[PDB]
Design an enzyme around this catalytic site. Structure first.
Site, mmCIF file in Angstrom:
data_model
loop_
_atom_site.group_PDB
_atom_site.id
_atom_site.type_symbol
_atom_site.label_atom_id
_atom_site.label_comp_id
_atom_site.label_asym_id
_atom_site.label_seq_id
_atom_site.Cartn_x
_atom_site.Cartn_y
_atom_site.Cartn_z
ATOM 1 C CG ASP A 35 -1.825 1.168 1.296
ATOM 2 O OD1 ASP A 35 -1.931 1.890 0.292
ATOM 3 O OD2 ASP A 35 -2.459 1.377 2.360
ATOM 4 C CB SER A 199 -2.134 14.322 -13.485
ATOM 5 O OG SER A 199 -2.532 14.068 -14.815
#
Length: 330
Positions: A35, A199
Site C-alpha cells: 500500500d 498530473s
C-alpha cells in the site's frame, strides 16, 4: 541488494493485489497488500481477536526465534475507506522477494474491522508511503522500504500491476525490459506523507487532451481512480445510460456498454487506461448495472491514482533524497 516479488489479484475484478512476505525465523509467509498510501506493516496474528479471524494466515511471534516485543509500542490506523485495525508491535526479520530487513517493525493486530475479517485473502498490509505517516506510538517506526533503502543498489521500488493478471514489485532496480518507450519523471510533495504529484491533464476516449493540473496521490492500496467531479462527469457523459447513483455510492453504467479509454498526463507524456480497466462488474450478482472504475473524489479531500490508473503503467517510486515518481507505458 535487490528484491523482486510477484503480486497477484485477489479476485476477478483486481479489487486488490497480494504479495507474499516472509516474516520471522523460520519464515512465516503471509500474503500482504502493498500500500503506497499508508506506512504501517501490520498482520493478522495469534493475538487477533479470534472472532475477527476468518481464513487469514496469521503471524505467531512466539514461534519466531528472531521476534522481539517492542516494549510499550502500540498502533492504531484508520483507512480512507472507513476500515481500521490496532494492536501491539514486534520487531522481526522481514523478506520480500529475496530482500531482507532485520529489525523491521511488524505490527500485530489485536483488533481488525469487519472488512478485513470478511476478506480471507489479505493477511495484512505493507505500507510504502513515507514513514512520517506510521502510527506506532510512542516511537514512530520506519517502513520496510525506508529500512531497506541504504542497502539497495538504487533507492527505488517499482510497481507493475497487472490487468486481470499477476504483476511485480521490484526493490532496488529498474527492470528496463518491463516497459515500452521512456519513463517520465515528475515531482513529488511529501508534505502529507504520500507520493503526491500533479498530473498535467486528461482526455476521454479519442477526445482532445485537456491541460489542467490535477494534484493527487499514487496509491496501490486503493482500487479505483478518484478524480474531481468535473473530470468524472466528463468521462461518464460519454457512456450512454451512465449516472451517479447516491444509493449505490457512485457512478454506475449499463453492463451492455463499451467503455471509452481515459488518458492522464505525466508531464508531456500520456498514460492510456483502456476502457475495459474501468469496468468493475455488476453492482450485485446478476444485476445489469455495473460499477464504474472512475469515481469522484469530492467527498475524500484528495485525488487518488489508485490501481485502475497505476496498472496501466510501469511506476517508479524514487526514494532519493528528493523523491520523484516515474511513469512509463507498458
Amino acid at each position: 541488494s535487490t528484491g523482486s516479488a510477484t503480486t497477484t489479484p485477489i479476485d476477478s475484478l483486481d479489487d486488490a493485489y497480494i504479495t507474499p512476505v516472509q516474516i520471522g525465523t523460520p519464515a512465516q509467509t503471509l500474503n500482504l497488500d502493498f500500500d503506497t498510501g499508508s506506512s504501517d506493516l501490520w498482520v493478522f496474528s495469534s493475538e487477533t481477536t479470534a472472532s475477527e479471524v476468518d481464513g487469514q494466515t496469521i503471524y505467531t511471534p512466539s514461534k519466531s526465534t528472531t521476534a522481539k516485543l517492542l516494549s510499550g509500542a502500540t498502533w492504531s490506523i484508520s483507512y480512507g475507506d472507513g476500515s481500521s485495525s490496532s494492536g501491539d508491535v514486534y520487531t522481526d526479520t522481514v523478506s520480500v522477494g529475496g530482500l531482507t530487513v532485520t529489525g523491521q517493525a511488524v505490527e500485530s493486530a489485536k483488533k481488525v474491522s469487519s472488512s478485513f475479517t470478511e476478506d480471507s485473502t489479505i493477511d495484512g498490509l505493507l505500507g510504502l508511503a513515507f514513514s512520517t505517516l506510521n502510527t506506532v506510538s510512542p516511537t514512530q517506526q520506519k517502513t520496510f522500504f525506508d529500512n531497506a533503502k541504504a542497502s539497495l543498489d538504487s533507492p527505488v521500488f517499482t510497481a507493475d500491476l497487472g490487468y486481470h493478471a499477476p504483476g511485480t514489485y521490484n526493490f532496488g532496480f529498474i527492470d528496463t525490459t518491463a516497459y515500452t518507450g521512456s519513463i517520465t519523471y515528475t515531482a513529488v510533495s511529501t508534505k502529507q506523507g504520500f507520493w503526491e504529484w500533479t498530473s498535467t491533464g486528461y482526455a476521454v476516449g479519442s477526445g482532445t487532451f485537456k491541460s489542467t493540473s490535477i494534484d493527487g496521490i499514487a496509491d496501490t492500496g486503493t482500487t479505483l481512480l478518484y478524480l474531481p467531479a468535473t473530470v468524472v462527469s466528463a468521462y461518464w457523459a460519454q457512456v450512454s445510460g451512465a449516472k451517479s447513483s447516491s444509493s449505490v455510492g457512485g457512478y454506475v453504467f449499463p453492463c451492455s456498454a463499451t467503455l471509452p479509454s481515459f488518458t492522464f498526463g505525466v508531464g508531456s507524456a500520456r498514460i492510456v487506461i483502456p476502457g475495459d480497466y474501468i469496468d468493475f462488474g455488476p453492482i450485485s450478482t446478476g444485476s445489469s448495472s455495473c460499477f464504474g472504475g472512475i469515481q469522484s473524489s469530492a467527498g475524500i479531500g484528495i485525488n487518488i491514482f489508485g490501481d485502475v490508473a497505476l496498472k496501466a503503467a510501469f511506476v517508479v517510486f524514487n526514494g532519493a533524497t528528493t523523491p520523484t515518481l516515474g511513469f512509463a507505458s507498458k
